Design a protein around this ligand. Structure first.
Ligand SMILES: [Ca+2]
Ligand SMILES: [Ca+2]
Length: 279
C-alpha cells in the first residue's frame, strides 16, 4: 500500500533517504496488535480512529483528554491518515492530568495496570505500550517500566527534551525498554532531543502532524512525537511476524537506517527507524 502526500515522518520511516512524501506499508497495517497509549487520554470519538480506540482506565475525575497530547500521540500510532499502524487497536490509560502533569506513583500504577489488563484483551499479534512522558531519575519508575517489558509488552519511551544525557531521566534511563530520540525532516537530531548511550533508536519528532482534541489536527514537536512512531512500527512488525515483544527494539535497531543522521554526539547510536518495506 502507499499513502501519497503523507506526513513527512511516515514517509521517512519507509525510505532509505530523506525528502520523500509517500508512506509505503504492508496492508496488514498492524491488524491484530494492540497499543496502550499511557498519557493524557485519547479522544476516542475522533473520526480518524474509526472506532479502533477506547479508554480503559483513568486516574482522574474523567477519562476525557482535556489536553490533546495523548490524542496526538495515539494518532501517530494508529490513526487512518496520521498513523504508522493504521489497523491496530488503541487503548488509552490516563495517567497525566489535563495540564500534562502526573505524579510518579500514578504513572507507576498505570504501567502495572497495563501488565495485568493485557490478559483481558484479544491481541493475537502482541501488545505494545507507548510512554511519551518522563521526569527526573527515579529507580521506582525505571523498575515499573522494566516490569511492564518483562510481562511481555514492547515498551517504547521518550528520551526527553532536555538536550542532555538521558541517563538522568526516567523511564528513559531504564536499559531494558526502547528509548527513543527525535530527528527532523533534514535528518538532523532534533535540537531538543536528549542523547546518550541509553538511547536505542531515533524516530521523527520535529513538526509532526497528527490528531488533536475537538476533532481537529495540529503539528507539534518532541521526543513525545518520535516515541509513537516506534511503538506503531513495533506493532506493524509484530503483525507481520518478523519480531516479538521481547526482541522488537533490537530488531528495529538491527534493521534501521544507519549513519543517516547529523548532530549525533559520539557515543550515541546513529540509527533511524525504518520499515524495510518492499512492494
Ligand atoms: Ca540513507
Ligand atoms: Ca534499551
Amino acid at each position: 500500500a502507499a499513502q501519497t502526500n503523507a506526513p513527512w515522518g511516515l514517509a521517512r520511516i519507509s525510505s532509505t533517504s530523506p525528502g520523500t512524501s509517500t508512506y509505503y506499508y504492508d496492508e496488514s497495517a498492524g491488524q491484530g496488535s494492540c497499543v496502550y497509549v499511557i498519557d493524557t487520554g485519547i479522544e476516542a470519538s475522533h473520526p480518524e480512529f474509526e472506532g479502533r480506540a477506547q479508554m480503559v482506565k483513568t486516574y482522574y475525575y474523567s477519562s476525557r483528554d482535556g489536553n490533546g497530547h495523548g490524542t496526538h500521540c495515539a494518532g501517530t500510532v494508529g490513526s487512518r491518515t496520521y498513523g504508522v499502524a493504521k489497523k491496530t487497536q488503541l487503548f488509552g490509560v490516563k495517567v497525566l492530568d489535563d495540564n500534562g502533569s502526573g505524579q510518579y506513583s500514578t504513572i507507576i500504577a498505570g504501567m502495572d495496570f497495563v501488565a495485568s489488563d493485557k490478559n483481558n484483551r484479544n491481541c493475537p499479534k502482541g501488545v505494545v505500550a507507548s510512554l511519551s512522558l518522563g521526569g527526573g531519575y527515579s529507580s521506582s519508575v525505571n523498575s515499573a517500566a522494566a516490569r511492564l517489558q518483562s510481562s511481555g509488552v514492547m515498551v517504547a519511551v521518550a528520551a526527553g527534551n532536555n538536550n542532555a544525557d538521558a541517563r538522568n531521566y526516567s523511564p528513559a534511563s531504564e536499559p531494558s525498554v526502547c528509548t527513543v530520540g527525535a530527528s527532523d525532516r533534514y535528518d538532523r537530531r532534533s535540537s531538543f532531543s536528549n542523547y546518550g548511550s541509553v538511547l536505542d533508536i531515533f524516530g521523527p519528532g520535529t513538526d509532526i502532524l497528527s490528531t488533536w482534541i475537538g476533532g481537529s489536527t495540529r503539528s507539534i514537536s518532541g521526543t513525545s512525537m518520535a516515541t509513537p512512531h516506534v511503538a506503531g512500527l513495533a506493532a506493524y512488525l509484530m503483525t507481520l511476524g518478523k519480531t516479538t515483544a521481547a526482541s522488537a527494539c533490537r530488531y528495529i535497531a538491527d534493521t534501521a537506517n544507519k549513519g543517516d543522521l547529523s548532530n549525533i554526539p559520539f557515543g550515541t547510536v546513529n540509527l533511524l527507524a525504518y520499515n524495510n518495506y518492499q512492494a
